[PDB]
Amino acid sequence: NVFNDAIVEKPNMEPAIPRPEQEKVAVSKLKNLEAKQGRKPNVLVLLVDDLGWGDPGVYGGGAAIGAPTPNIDKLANEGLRLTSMYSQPTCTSSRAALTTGRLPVRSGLVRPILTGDKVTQNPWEKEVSQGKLLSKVGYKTALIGKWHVGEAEGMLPHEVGFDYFYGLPSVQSDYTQFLVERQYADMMTNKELYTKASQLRPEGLIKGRKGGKREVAYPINSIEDISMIDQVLRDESVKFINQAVDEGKPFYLIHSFSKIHNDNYPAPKYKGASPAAMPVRDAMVEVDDITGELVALLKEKGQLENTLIIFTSDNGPNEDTWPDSGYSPWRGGKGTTWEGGVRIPGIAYWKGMISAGQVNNGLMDLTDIYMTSLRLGGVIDELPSNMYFDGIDQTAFLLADNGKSRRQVVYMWSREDFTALRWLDYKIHFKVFNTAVPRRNIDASFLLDIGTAPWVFNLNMDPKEMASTGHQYFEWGMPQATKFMKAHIATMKKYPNTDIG
Amino acid sequence: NVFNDAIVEKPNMEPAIPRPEQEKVAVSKLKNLEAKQGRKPNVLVLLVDDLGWGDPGVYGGGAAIGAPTPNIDKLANEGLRLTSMYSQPTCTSSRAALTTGRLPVRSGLVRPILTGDKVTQNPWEKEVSQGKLLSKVGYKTALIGKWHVGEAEGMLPHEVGFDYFYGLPSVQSDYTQFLVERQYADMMTNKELYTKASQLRPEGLIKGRKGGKREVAYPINSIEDISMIDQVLRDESVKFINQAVDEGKPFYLIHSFSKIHNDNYPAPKYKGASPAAMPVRDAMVEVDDITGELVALLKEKGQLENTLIIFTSDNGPNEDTWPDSGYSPWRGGKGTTWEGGVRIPGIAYWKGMISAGQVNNGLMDLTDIYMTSLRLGGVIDELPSNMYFDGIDQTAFLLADNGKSRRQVVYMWSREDFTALRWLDYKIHFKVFNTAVPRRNIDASFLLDIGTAPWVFNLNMDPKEMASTGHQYFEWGMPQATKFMKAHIATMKKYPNTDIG
Amino acid sequence: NVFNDAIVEKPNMEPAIPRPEQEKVAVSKLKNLEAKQGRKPNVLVLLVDDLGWGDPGVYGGGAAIGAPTPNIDKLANEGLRLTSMYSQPTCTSSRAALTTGRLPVRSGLVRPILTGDKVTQNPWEKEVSQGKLLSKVGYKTALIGKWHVGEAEGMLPHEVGFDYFYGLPSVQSDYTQFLVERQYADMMTNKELYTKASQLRPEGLIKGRKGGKREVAYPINSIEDISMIDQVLRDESVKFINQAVDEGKPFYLIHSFSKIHNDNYPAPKYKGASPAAMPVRDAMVEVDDITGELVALLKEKGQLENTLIIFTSDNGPNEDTWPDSGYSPWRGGKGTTWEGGVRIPGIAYWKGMISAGQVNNGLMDLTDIYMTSLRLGGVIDELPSNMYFDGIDQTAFLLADNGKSRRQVVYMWSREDFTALRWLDYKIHFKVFNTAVPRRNIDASFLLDIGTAPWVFNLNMDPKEMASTGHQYFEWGMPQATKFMKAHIATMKKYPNTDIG
Amino acid sequence: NVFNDAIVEKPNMEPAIPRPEQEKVAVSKLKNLEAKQGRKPNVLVLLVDDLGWGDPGVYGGGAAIGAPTPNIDKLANEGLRLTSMYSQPTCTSSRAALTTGRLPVRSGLVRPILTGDKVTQNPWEKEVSQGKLLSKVGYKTALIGKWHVGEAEGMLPHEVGFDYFYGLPSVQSDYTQFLVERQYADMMTNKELYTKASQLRPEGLIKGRKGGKREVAYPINSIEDISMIDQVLRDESVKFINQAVDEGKPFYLIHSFSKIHNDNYPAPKYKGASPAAMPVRDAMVEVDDITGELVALLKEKGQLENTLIIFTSDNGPNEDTWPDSGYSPWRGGKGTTWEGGVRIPGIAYWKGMISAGQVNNGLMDLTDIYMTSLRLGGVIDELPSNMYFDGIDQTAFLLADNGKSRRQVVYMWSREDFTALRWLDYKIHFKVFNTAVPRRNIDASFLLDIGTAPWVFNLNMDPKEMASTGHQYFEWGMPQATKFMKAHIATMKKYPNTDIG
Ligand SMILES: [Ca+2]
Ligand SMILES: [Ca+2]
Ligand SMILES: [Ca+2]
Ligand SMILES: [Ca+2]
Ligand SMILES: [Cl-]
Ligand SMILES: [Cl-]
Ligand SMILES: [Cl-]
Ligand SMILES: [Cl-]
Ligand SMILES: [Cl-]
Ligand SMILES: [Cl-]
Ligand SMILES: [Cl-]
Ligand SMILES: [Cl-]
């Protein structure tokens, strides 16, 4: 009551903090841009896989860990670097959030659905992607790269709203487990066992158009083939941007790198390209080079001033596959709701629109990228009213100089378990991941109920979440955090979550 | 059943062990006293906040920890010292039990209900305090000091039965978080955050009479003000006792010290008064002096022979706020069902009724003080029959020389979680608190399910609960411990617990 | 499904993997044996209590831990040694599975029912023991030694199907706790407590015949008496084998040693007989000698060629009672679903039927001994169709040279909690036991929920379960492990488990 | 300079804090006593083995752990209770300190020297016991009970200065390891191994007069014999006190209980005499009764007012032998320099000399008992000048009302390793004992070097030494703590320590 600064706009939309003065600056910047450009703006989402908060140089990594990222760094120094961007703790949960504007517990997309899985419902028949909505108002929409949000009938991007799909229906490790003989020898060198397991082996990169069928476009059956995966994806993103711009149409492209998911096999060009001379760091060099190649293309096509570029990650680093892992200064990693698992890099670049040199610690969510995309295209009013949407339009936050965020709380779920939330700079845990083996967040952990008080970390003072102080310094704020929790869960009674059985 | 010595008297009352010979002695002592005194006895309950089992010198602390307690020692040495007195693990839960005869899971009083809380019904309408029942038979009843059992409309002591209330609706820490700027700087020196949080800042000590309005009798706006808090409470209890004795009516007074809850600020007189010269120890010297002043007042009024004095705590030491913490020799502390959290000091003094120099290890509960009080006033038959009462009348235990307890089992709850029980000298845990940071029982703990066998500690042999032996030496008793658990839970099916929503 | 090699025979029977060629060998071997022998075969089950996987010399113990086991080694080296035999984590549960062919969560026999518990219905009215079915087709069936699956009315072996019973209704520790004064002094030297606890003291060894009353055959009132317990049981098993062979009837005998359950008191002639010179190691030598005596009796009576001998254990070592404990190389022990508690020794010997010198790592369960017995006697078709049976006939697996197992999965329950399963050589934990005090698997453990991924151990590579790799090397098999788990739980939706209340 | 309040009197003597006014009171009390009594005072040292700080009732034990100690409580309540009394971590070391006035690293008496251990020189030829010095000025000196400071030639009390010795040359567990067959079966039931070990079996209690031979006065060949051990010792102290009073000579008697060292076998009449009904608690009752018997003897002979009674322990509880162990609230136990091992109970009773009801937290040491004894007998001026003496005369501390101690610092050694010191209420660790298994302070511990700062505990605020704060609050005092350490080590270069080889 005395703390809640959010206002309910539509009952099925996450309440947002009004920023009227920032909204006026945003509306004005977009009006003048479209006058000069003659059409709606493009959006380029560069989505790296399992990238940690600290991997880019501007976040305290780069040359400090043997993989300088000059292009990503330049994108940040000449734009807006978000230090409190949040994702979900796992691949599918985050990519679902980014393409539905909904916490995955609502949609049922907490785990990838396989081609032979028994489901009572295809969740995508009910969910609405930004490709669907933006397509209807003139955008050419595409997801190029990793999907991992369902590969059964009617679940690929070009089947759920996007005009064009090209990439991996599952994930890198699904391919490499049938390629690195020694690493997976218990299955690879066991003939009887390999005969069974290889029947569910992925074929390669899939290509698909809205209204058409799926096609194998780049088969993968060796390490040499898979080492070119991100080069091939880069080739398709270039062709997609060339085609959309040459046709004078606004485009919306999610470029979903395969890297740096394990097992990383960078292109031969990049073997030893990083000072560290390790596959995952070489892969980071390849990601930084492809990022620069796409920025250069837009600059050469004269569309850089009309393109919002978002560089982010889908979750924290996968320490379980060390040394094939990224780096994050925070506690934990992929598979936990510690900050290591969910606090991720987030860079917003828009030449002429977003002032250079900004570092902003305002709260932001992957679902906010979804909802900002919808507002940029002018289609927020097209969302269904019987579904609850967790995303918040952050246009006023991104386009204002040192603007304040419109999001008040970040809610954190481990699939169907609600575990923690962040309000202001305070991190409140109601369920805690406890790891038995160092680095083994996913594979050797417990999810434990807290005791008398939820764990509380002031992230400004204890960002690495080393020791909880609970109620000691937070008696004034604890009941409000509980109110945020209960209200959040209440929205899931008012709007039932999907059970896909 | 070869073990159960308890007998069902009224179906809605915790079964008690008959002590018929001790009861004859108690009936005779009470009869002769009322014939000589001319009216029912007074009861004075001295309730110290967050005092550990070993804080008083007579329990093994005092001078050993740099804070002598001579007056409290004299109460024990000239009366009865209980070494197996039990409370609830936290403030609100223990204070509800003391004023309702009921484990707080039955009443819903596991958390303090603040103003503006959503509740189906005010739990206190249904509950029956000893103030209500004793006031009905001519007692002047008062609670002076800390309440912390609800501050919304109709929840202060003068609105739930007591004739007079004077003290803190909430708790010391609620006041001090708005006074110690540096300790709470993230809120106090943040202008916008302070403006919001300070709107729920308590104004001071609240004064209230049955049938009247709440008044702010003593404002608290500085450390200087709050440093006198326990001197002001002492003054009010002196006025109350004087007024009741001058009217010739029996008094029932719960003097609920604010000390030694954090943040401790003793009166200026007591700065450096303890050899330790630390706030929490200086506060212990202040509590001991006030105890002696109240005893000396009763002596000067000629009411010591007709006054039962009970000195006790509401829970174990708050180790989380170290070094502003009491001391206990047992494991854990406040916020856990380790012995450190629930095994608390307990002294019964009654000049001419309770023989001096008794140390008794018989089981006793805070709810037993409630039920003992009701019997001394002759009002047990007034308890509603639709509610289960956990308290047991212990008058035959307190008034018998080296008497045996009427309580067979102590049941331990963490709010809505049943975690452990004690039977004879055996502590059986069905859920265990596990602490991740030293001293951080409340703020950095888990509540974990046990494995194949409940944990068992022979408290005579392992009082510090260092390592469980489970079934190894307790096969004969383990099935009975489970029978006690099952029956205890079954009473909550036959007598439903309150859901306040 | 590409992984599932099992086939549904009957809908209420655990699916098995067909082994047609092994089955032909089994059918032919049995037909020729019965031609020369003139009657169905005998089955002698030697069941040692709390014996670890590695206690026998052939399993890496014996002389290595100061207790040679030559006779048991002879059964293994002249027969078939199973290195992946599994039990339940505790006594009652395992013996229920051995005598009902059903995981104890289905029957309700997760705990011993005491003569004085009052249960909705006696589970043995519904459960079908191999004694009932085999006696119906001409077998003389007996259980001699430890029972521990209920001692209330109609729960002893001679009341639930077996023709003859002689042994302990409960367990060794139930007797020795009233005999070893010092070890149990808190109860033994406390007059009041002993008077109550000893009312439930077992009188001695109970004898019973189908259709007859219970009798106290061997009173136990001293260490002297109970030190001969396994010598008495040996004498009874000798009488029973002699009389079945003299009468020309096939016999089914479960010899259930009291050893090596605590507190071990071997016969005087074995004091110091082991090099280690400790009670539990002396008890091991006594067990080995008794094994050799029964085998010699078969050879003397000319029945060794027509007798399948199964040497196995009921659960892993009880480390909590150290140093009165067996040995196992695996993690944990009795009371946990770690391999230490469930992976147990398993030796099958059948002179002339099972080729000597075999070591086989195929999966096998105690319920498979039940189901294999029923097929050897030819009565599998007599099982009720409204009850699910987890046992699998392993006759083709035991009578084939280096044959493959018919069991695809072992399912592991901690009473009512499903915790893990084994498929192929992979151990997958869904709930993990965590021990807070070394050796204290039963008495100081937690049962914790896993985090993002189930814990996975390749037992060939990590047989001691030292650090889980989870999904890292098992992405191809993890969905199939989930399919097994969910299908297993589904069988208990279709066939309800017994709620004994 | 700024902090040191001690003064150097003789260069080979530990400096002491002058207490001139307390010394004036002490000289007057002793003068008036000797006028009325007619001779020098008696001293009775009651020394319990492995007794914890909290075991007596007045220290927070007794009835709270099921073993009341009324006679020991009465000594404290009617005398002076010391809450900061310190010993050494082990038996031999502490008993050396008590009978030499010197930290045992100086004398070489850190381990008991066994018959024929081949030493460079018997260390007792250099040390000067109070028996020797007091005997020269007319005292009858005796040690009755446990010795444990050397069994070789010339090492028993009657050979190193005491007039009379009667008791155990070694320790209780030296006898019982040859009496409890099952507990020590690896040796007892191994014929060849028992034959070897039993050649060093102690034959029983040894008796000796100054200038006479050793004699076997009570043979111990069974549990029956040893169960009376402390009754036999009580008889001898009675005979000794009677003989001294009838001869009119002042007596100095160290009554060294065998209890409560493992394995505890109390007299038959005490079996179950404690409420806990456990051997170690029954033994506590026997010790309390014998204490009361000796006090009543002195009163009956008319010497109570001329007898200083010291009740204390030689070290903390032996948790390794749990449940045959005492109790202490502090961390650790016997075998460590945690407070649990060295902070011991200490009571001083002197009817008419020491005012009743005192509790004093001043620093006190076992070596101070030695030096105080020498003062009372008037023989301090007879100490050699080539040995450094650590003991300090505390007569002014024990005979003053709430007097301050003459000891500034307590230095703590683990045999030859300097580990910690206490100054004021601050405990400073330079080496730390880390315990790998709960309770196993002696048997499963490491001795670790600290890191950048010595560990510091304010014992008033953290008496259980839960978490060190080091320099954080002690920068003003840490350089002084280091000065104390270095000066202490310097005394050992000026006065070299003994190398026994
Ligand atoms: Ca990912
Ligand atoms: Ca409290
Ligand atoms: Ca067993
Ligand atoms: Ca000792
Ligand atoms: Cl604004
Ligand atoms: Cl290349
Ligand atoms: Cl009675
Ligand atoms: Cl003041
Ligand atoms: Cl086959
Ligand atoms: Cl024998
Ligand atoms: Cl002085
Ligand atoms: Cl006796």
Author numbering:
A (entry chain C), B (entry chain A), C (entry chain B), D (entry chain D): 21 to 521
Excerpt from the publication:
Here, we report the first functional characterization and the first crystal structure of a prokaryotic sulfatase, PsFucS1, belonging to sulfatase subfamily S1_13, able to release sulfate from fucoidan oligosaccharides. PsFucS1 was identified in the genome of a Pseudoalteromonas sp. isolated from sea cucumber gut. PsFucS1 (57 kDa) is Ca2+ dependent and has an unusually high optimal temperature (68 °C) and thermostability. Sulfatases represent a large family of enzymes that catalyze the hydrolytic cleavage of sulfate ester groups on carbohydrates (EC 3.1.6.-sulfuric ester hydrolases; EC 3.10.1.-sulfamidases) and are divided into four classes based on homology, crystal structures, and catalytic mechanism.
The overall structure revealed that each PsFucS1 monomer is organized in a catalytic N-terminal domain (Asn21-Leu419) region and a C-terminal domain (Val430-Gly521) typical of the formylglycine dependent sulfatase fold. Further, the PsFucS1 displays a unique quaternary hexameric structure comprising a tight trimeric dimer complex. The structural data imply that this hexamer formation results from an uncommon interaction of each PsFucS1 monomer that is oriented perpendicular to the common dimer interface (~ 1500 Å2) that can be found in analogous sulfatases. A single peak with an estimated apparent molecular mass of approximately 291 kDa was observed, corroborating a hexameric structure of PsFucS1 in solution, the theoretical molecular mass of which is calculated to be 345.8 kDa (and 172.4 kDa for a trimer). Mapping electrostatic potential onto the surface of PsFucS1 highlights a positively charged pocket, perfectly suited for the recognition of a sulfate group. The active site of sulfatases normally encompasses the catalytic nucleophile formylglycine residue but the Fo-Fc difference density of the X-ray structure of PsFucS1 showed no evidence of significant maturation of the catalytic Cys111, but undoubtedly showed the unmodified cysteine.
